[PDB]
Amino acid sequence: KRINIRLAHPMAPGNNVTVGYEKFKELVAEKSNGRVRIQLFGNCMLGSDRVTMEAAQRGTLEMASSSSPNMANFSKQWMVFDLPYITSPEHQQKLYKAIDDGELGKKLDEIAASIGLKPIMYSEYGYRNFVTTKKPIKTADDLKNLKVRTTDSPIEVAVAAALGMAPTPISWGETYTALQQGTVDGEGNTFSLLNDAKHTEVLKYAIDSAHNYSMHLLMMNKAYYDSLPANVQQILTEAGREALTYQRSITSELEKKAEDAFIEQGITVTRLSPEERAKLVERTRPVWDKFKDDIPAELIKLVQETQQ
């Protein structure tokens, strides 16, 4: 008989994370010949990121996807991935290998288990970049005294302050108005979300700072997973792994298209010099020692090992 598995997530139609979960649904159906069906509830149809991951943890929902910074609200260990410049785009393929098949992946499995969850896909969300409405930013010093919108992430706030910026936490929904009306000067996010949300209408400058990395973590209730037949577990695990291959590639392509939409809209996108990138790394590194006591050294080391 048919197994119906509900999957909740916060992302909008056509979004890189959404299309990965569509691939997941398609592969689960193919592999199970229709016996297992993923029912998608995107765009917060079942709740916010937090509401749906609590339901998955508790066992009233089978699967949910949460951003890595939002997972820090269930377990602080996930904060390792938010540290400034802990990873960079140049080493992304080795990061994926470590998560997919390596000791990093296994430790993350254990951490999820301790809060009632089984990881199924580590969806790529991307690297955040600083953008501004009116003030040109081409250098590290250009960032000093910028009023910048932040999320509620303590690491995001610390990074802004380390760079001499003035951080203001503002909900996503209030951020367009804050930029338009001038209560902040800028923000930091992926080019794809900024363009998709039409913030580009009010922006004029961007730098490829890549000062924050994140993922969207698709989790299954672990007790539920452990209740399934071996062959169904295998279907889910394999569909996840294969959908992720596609999702990581689609993310790259959508980010290129987002960056082109920026240029088309007259936004000046500065490619930081090695000298200027180095200053952002150096200025932000004290943030790691500030949060040292809250993130396990072993986990920092496993992530750094992917970068060299």
Author numbering: 29 to 336
The article reads:
O. alaskensis employs a tripartite ATP-independent periplasmic (TRAP) transporter (OaIsePQM) to import isethionate, which relies on the substrate-binding protein (OaIseP) to scavenge isethionate and deliver it to the membrane transporter component (OaIseQM) for import into the cell. Like the ATP-binding cassette importers, TRAP transporters utilise a high-affinity substrate-binding protein (P-subunit) that binds the organic acid and delivers it to the membrane-spanning transporter subunits (Q and M) for uptake.
Of these three datasets, only the 1.48 Å dataset was truly ligand-free, whereas the other two datasets had sulfonate-containing buffering compounds [4-(2-hydroxyethyl)-1-piperazineethanesulfonic acid (HEPES) and 2-(N-morpholino)ethanesulfonic acid (MES)] in the substrate-binding site arising from the crystallisation condition (see crystallisation and structure determination methods). In the HEPES-bound structure, Arg156 is tilted slightly further from the sulfonate group, only granting a single nitrogen atom of the guanidyl group to form hydrogen bonds with the HEPES sulfonate, whereas Arg156 is turned slightly closer to the MES sulfonate allowing the respective salt bridge to form. The smaller MES utilises a bridging water molecule hydrogen bond Ala40 to the morpholine ring oxygen. In contrast, it is interesting that the slightly smaller MES does not induce partial closure, considering the water molecule bridging the hydrogen bond with Ala40 could be removed and a direct hydrogen bond could be formed instead. This suggests that these molecules bind weakly, or that it is the full closure of the protein around the ligand that induces thermal stability.
